[PDB]
Amino acid sequence: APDREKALELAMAQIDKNFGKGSVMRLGEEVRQPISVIPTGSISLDVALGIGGLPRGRVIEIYGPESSGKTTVALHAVANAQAAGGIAAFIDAEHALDPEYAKKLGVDTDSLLVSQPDTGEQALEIADMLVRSGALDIIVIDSVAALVPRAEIEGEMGDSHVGLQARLMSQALRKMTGALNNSGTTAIFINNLRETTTGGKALKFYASVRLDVRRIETLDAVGNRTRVKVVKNKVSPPFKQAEFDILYGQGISREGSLIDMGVEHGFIRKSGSWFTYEGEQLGQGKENARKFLLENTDVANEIEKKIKEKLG
Numbered sequence: 001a002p003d004r005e006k007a008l009e010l011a012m013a014q015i016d017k018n019f020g021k022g023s024v025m026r027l028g029e030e031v032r033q034p035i036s037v038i039p040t041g042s043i044s045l046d047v048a049l050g051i052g053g054l055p056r057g058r059v060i061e062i063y064g065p066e067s068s069g070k071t072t073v074a075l076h077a078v079a080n081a082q083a084a085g086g087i088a089a090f091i092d093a094e095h096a097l098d099p100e101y102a103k104k105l106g107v108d109t110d111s112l113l114v115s116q117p118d119t120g121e122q123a124l125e126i127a128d129m130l131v132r133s134g135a136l137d138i139i140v141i142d143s144v145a146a147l148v149p150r151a152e153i154e155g156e157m158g159d160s161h162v163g164l165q166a167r168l169m170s171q172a173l174r175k176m177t178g179a180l181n182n183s184g185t186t187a188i189f190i191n192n193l194r195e196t197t198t199g200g201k202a203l204k205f206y207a208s209v210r211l212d213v214r215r216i217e218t219l220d221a222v223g224n225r226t227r228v229k230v231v232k233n234k235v236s237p238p239f240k241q242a243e244f245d246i247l248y249g250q251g252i253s254r255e256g257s258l259i260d261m262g263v264e265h266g267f268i269r270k271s272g273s274w275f276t277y278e279g280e281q282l283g284q285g286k287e288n289a290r291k292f293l294l295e296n297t298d299v300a301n302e303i304e305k306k307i308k309e310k311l312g
């Protein structure tokens with residue numbers, strides 16, 4: 001009477017129907033309900049996500065050390081969403097955002113809404129008010145840790161010291177998720193690591209996608225290589241990983257990506273020390289090749305094409 005796979009499929013079906021699609025899924029599964037997504041600005045990361053970018057109407061947490069590339073991403077996400085004619089907001093509580101660099105990553109700063117809250121409650125509240133107006137495609141909250149409660153900011157005491165900030169972030173997400181779904185706005189929370197920062201406790205359970213950003217290399221001193229791990233993903237098989245270069249003053253390196261993904265996917269052969277594409281001499285050294293691809297825009301484009309074809 002028992003047929004495991006048939007039994008298992010009925011279970012999984014019932015599992016998803018009780019808690020939502022993605023509640024449980026095989027790892028090497030392969031996605032085919034394409035969603036709506038905001039390209040991460042990193043081709044590899046987008047693939048790692050399984051859906052070509054950050055899902056819309058979802059809560060995203062991008063945690064990691066400082067200077068590991070979180071912001072560059074989130075900014076790119078913003079820029080992409082704008083090109084698609086979407087409106088963006090930045091709840092800033094760190095006062096660090098460099099708008100000049102932002103423009104360089106393609107963000108139309110002038111049309112970017114910026115807010116600088118007086119308290120964690122206010123910050124979250126301001127963000128909720130914006131979200132449920134349905135005019136936003138994306139909203140970035142800088143620094144989960146800066147969401148310090150009012151009582152704490154204001155004088156208050158050594159008593160009734162509490163874990164108020166976490167509960168602050170819980171109640172907030174509790175009601176701002178439903179809205180995010182209806183609205184369809186993607187909310188990226190930037191969590192600088194140094195509970196994963198007190199409020200990251202609740203974020204951990206409310207995020208549909210959680211990215212673990214790390215600084216790994218240091219491609220002279222041009223820029224540095226980042227590695228992201230999709231530790232949580234309720235919309236595609238989780239745990240995938242991606243890598244990309246962010247040069248100083250520049251955002252995520254396109255050519256860089258292409259050179260990497262092109263290599264691993266065989267489109268560009270890499271005789272040790274010398275990169276070649278369809279018999280073309282690309283140059284010795286990822287950089288001489290990055291350059292090559294930067295200058296001979298025509299190549300790379302066909303290689304971006306070929307790689308895009310082979311995947312999605």
Ligand SMILES: Nc1ncnc2c1ncn2[C@H]1C[C@H](O)[C@@H](COP(=O)(O)OP(=O)(O)OP(=O)(O)O)O1
Pocket residue numbers: 064065066067068069070071072073096098101190192213223224246247248249250
């Ligand atoms: N204002 C800038 N000037 C020059 N390069 C920058 C600037 N901002 C970002 N970059 C580039 C070079 C940095 O090595 C790379 C990583 O920094 P960032 O992308 O800001 O890291 P991060 O997102 O992990 O920091 P944060 O803790 O604020 O999130 O981005």
